[PDB]
Every structure is written in C-alpha cells, then in structure tokens.
C-alpha cells in the first residue's frame, strides 16, 4: 500500500510528458511506468519523470483550491502543494501563500497566490508514486506524489 496518501480527485487532469495529452487520474489507475512532468527543486526546472504506480484511496472529503490565474484542483486535506516556504498540506494553506505552478504558454515555476479554498464534497481520490522527484503536474499545478511503503512492510 502507501506509506502516506496525498490524494487528489479522480477528475484531476494529469499532464502526460510523452504524448503531450492530459488524462484524468481516475483513468490512469490501470496504467504504470508512464512519464509525467515534475519540478526538480534543486534546478527549479521541470523534468519528465516516471510514475511507478497509481492508487485509488477510496472516498474522501475533497476541497477545491483556486489560484489567481484560475488554476483549480479538488484534493484531500492531506494533499501537498509547494509554497515559497516549502511543501504544505492543503489544510495548512492560507490566502497569504503562493503556490508553485508550471509556467504555461523565463523560469519554469511561476508562483501564484491562493484566492479560494473551499470544502466541496466526497469523491473517490487517487495518488501517484513518482520515485525521485516525488511530484507531478495535475490541473497545471504542482502536487506532491505519495510515498509507497516498502514491500516488506515498511
């Protein structure tokens, strides 16, 4: 299973680096070893990175997060986003935070303030594991990847 879940709504659109297409994460549950876009925090550049496994974490409460440019995602309270002061849980974010977005359309990260965080409802939620960089782009937002438990029990 997962050591810890940072799950997001199944409707979240995952940018697939190989094909340049976006696919809802719920539709990736039976897929593995495909490439996503992830931030390398050491270089602040986006890199292609391989997903090892997709997980369905069950029904959970989700919250809609919105940034100024209009980026939006539905995620659990435990999903993590990258702020100027490091990774934070969705339920730790406030309107004073900026979150990291991949640049769209010089740097690779654009920092955008949060304008809304709202409880939305209960949905099936999903996680990706991304060994190494441990993050991926969903709905054009950087989100942290979950951590799989060691096969022996971890």
Author numbering: -6 to -1, 1 to 99, 115 to 163
Paper lines:
The M86 mutant of the Ssp DnaB intein (here referred to as WT intein) was selected by sequential directed evolution for its more general activity and is one of the few known intein mutants with improved extein promiscuity.
Strikingly, the functional complementation of the catalytic His73 through a large (–1) side chain also extended to a single H73A mutant of the M86 intein. Here, splicing activity was restored, whereas the same intein with the native Gly(–1) was completely inactive. Again, this hypothesis was confirmed by the crystal structure of the G(–1)F/H73A mutant, which revealed that significant changes are indeed restricted to the N-terminal splice junction. The effects are even more pronounced in the M86(G(–1)F/H73A) mutant. Here, the dihedral angle φ of the Ala1 residue is twisted to –76°, which represents a marked change of up to 91° relative to the other M86 structures. The resulting twist rotates the carbonyl of the scissile peptide bond toward the space liberated by the missing His73 side chain. This water molecule seems to stabilize the twisted conformation by coordinating the carbonyl oxygens of Phe(–1) and of the block G His153. The overall distortion of the plane with the scissile peptide bond, described by the angle ω, increases from the M86 intein (ω = 179°) to the G(–1)F mutant (ω = –173°) and the G(–1)F/H73A double mutant (ω = –159°). In particular the latter structure, with 21° off from the optimal trans-conformation, suggests that the mutations have a significant effect on the stability of the peptide bond.
